[model samples]
Target: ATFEIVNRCSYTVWAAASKGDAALDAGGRQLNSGESWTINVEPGTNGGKIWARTDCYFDDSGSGICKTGDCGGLLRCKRFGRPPTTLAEFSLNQYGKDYIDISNIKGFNVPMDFSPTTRGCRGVRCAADIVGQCPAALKAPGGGCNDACTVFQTSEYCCTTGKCGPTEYSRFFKRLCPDAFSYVLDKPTTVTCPGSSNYRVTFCPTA
Candidate 1:
């Protein structure tokens, strides 16, 4: 099996691999904001933060912006962040909504978390941290701030102001979509976003 990316931007951007056999190094991958790549997907086809820590910044969210970056793939549990435990999450592509494209593949080994509390950002699948991803130098019992003052499309600027927006909260994704992430498992799965607003996935089925 194989997958290929189609550039939909006006300008050329950097893109790094993050899912297959050779995912661009986990530390940081910078997918030229507008460029795409063709990939050879293995049995366990997986892709991740194509553009992370670009310019030394870890915008693992996969969103091109320094802030507002999502973990990518619209919304698929398998696409969750993986550090200690792979975080569960959803992408807009896995929606049954009226906003963007939807009619893509749904119902997989990993499905969206279904709680109404977390809705917009990534559908309750947002993950927070790795038990110990920091280096020895950065880790301490509990001094000033244990982790490095890494930046994101959202928090890089907020840390100083000590203030965040869309709701007056910390963490980047949540501020805008407080109910973005779901936290339940009693609902039947549905493709929220469908039609042209679909996954737009291009692939070589018999690779």
Candidate 2:
């Protein structure tokens, strides 16, 4: 499968991909407004993630800090980024199909959409203006919304008990982005499709 990253926000975005096959060459890359990048995920590569790091300033050698979603303060993230970042999570070619979703379980830094670029597959997304509408209690200092787990850090919010269900906090996100992983066990976010499909991960697809 192949993953394409497209930026449609008003500002620049430093993108990161990690933990997948052929994963963007071990680094962070920049995409100005309307810019894009694509990476091919080799067959058998799976369980990778994609996200955006915003308000970043990097040195010539690609060392820098981002206002949000910094991956250990490095440019090319060698690992997954910190929240509150919107995430595109995937498991490719598992059980004869690819599984993908946009997760806000770590919170949401940007609106995002994930769509398979093939027929017989449906696209799923959470393209709401979450940052602006984020509840005051769950707002991040840099930007974006915070998950209940991040805010309360309790068994209920974290869903540590396995049977814990949604709270008003989780429901807030659910109401805006029913297609996303608002909390643990938001199973509806997960989608399965034939492995032949490619995907588009877009920031602000509505724009």
Candidate 3:
């Protein structure tokens, strides 16, 4: 599948994608406002994630720190990345279907739109002003919002014990981005599209 990652935010962003041991797009790349990076996903790529890092400064060696979504301070990430990131998660070519979702379970940074370009599948977006309205406890150090699980780490929030549900914290995110996975068990937000569908992940999406 072809994946287009676009940056519509006014500021620059570094886009990253990961699938198991493979880091797509060479781990990450810098994108100025209105710039984009296109990648081809291998069929049957499962447990994949795409996100953006903010407020970063990298030397020629591609070593730097991002205020949010930093992955080992490398230009190319070897892991999924830190929390407080808006995520576009997907599993492609699974039983002739592609499962995709926008998730705030880690937290929220920039608004995002994760959608298919074909197959008439509905798109999902999390375009709320989550950072501006972030609750005190769930606020991150530099920017973006934090998830309740990241903040408290309690079973009720993290669902570590496998017995959990929506709390005021998850509900806060849910109310803003109804199509996003607000919590660990937020299953309804997942969308199933045709395996042949191409996808787009837009940062700071206007709609």
Candidate 4:
């Protein structure tokens, strides 16, 4: 699968990707507004994720901190990013199909659109002003909104005991981005596309 990551936000974004223990494309790249990067995934690359890091400053050695989605202060991330980030998650060539979703389970920073560019597969998006409307208890330190689970860590929000359902907090996210995974058990938000399909992930996407 090929992923074309685009930044449509007014500010800069550092795009990051991870698959298992390895980082893709040296893990990250700086993208000014309207800039983009492309990555090709090996077939059967499961449990991979792509996201955007905002408000970052990196030195020549590619070390820096981001207001959102920082991966241990490394520009070339070796692991998944820190929360309050929007995710484009995918499992490719699983059972001859590709599964994908826009996930807010870790919370949300920038708006995103995740879409297939082949096989007429459907797309999903989350472009709500979540930061502006975030509740005080679920607000991140710098920017972005936090998920209920991240904030409270209670069974009802985290589903740690395996018995959970949507709460007002999860509903608040669901109401804004119906296509995203608002909570851990939000399965219907997942979308399927043909294997080997190309996709695009746009940050701060416009209508």
Worst 10 residues of 1 by lDDT: 102-111
- Where model 4 places Cα greater than 4 Å from the true spot, the runs are none
Question: Per-residue alpha-carbon lDDT of model 2 for 1-207, expressed as tens digits?
Answer: 677889988889998888733345555689899998887766656778889999998898888899878887788887778789888888887868888888888899988888888876788888898888899999988877889898888998888989788788888888899998888876676888887689888988897
Ten residues in a row with the worst lDDT in model 4? Answer: 18-27
For each candidate, the alpha-carbon lDDT, in order, equals 0.26, 0.83, 0.89, 0.89
Better of 1 and 2 by TM-score: 2
Indicate the worst ten consecutive residues by lDDT in candidate 2: 19-28
Query: Stretches of candidate 1 above 4 Å error?
Result: 19-21, 24-36, 45-47, 52-172, 175-207
User: Which residues of candidate 2, in runs, are more than 4 Å off?
Assistant: 20-24
* Candidate 4 Cα RMSD after full superposition onto the native fold (Å): 1.2
Count of backbone collisions within predicted model 2 = 2
User: Which stretches of candidate 3 lie above 4 Å from their native place?
Assistant: none
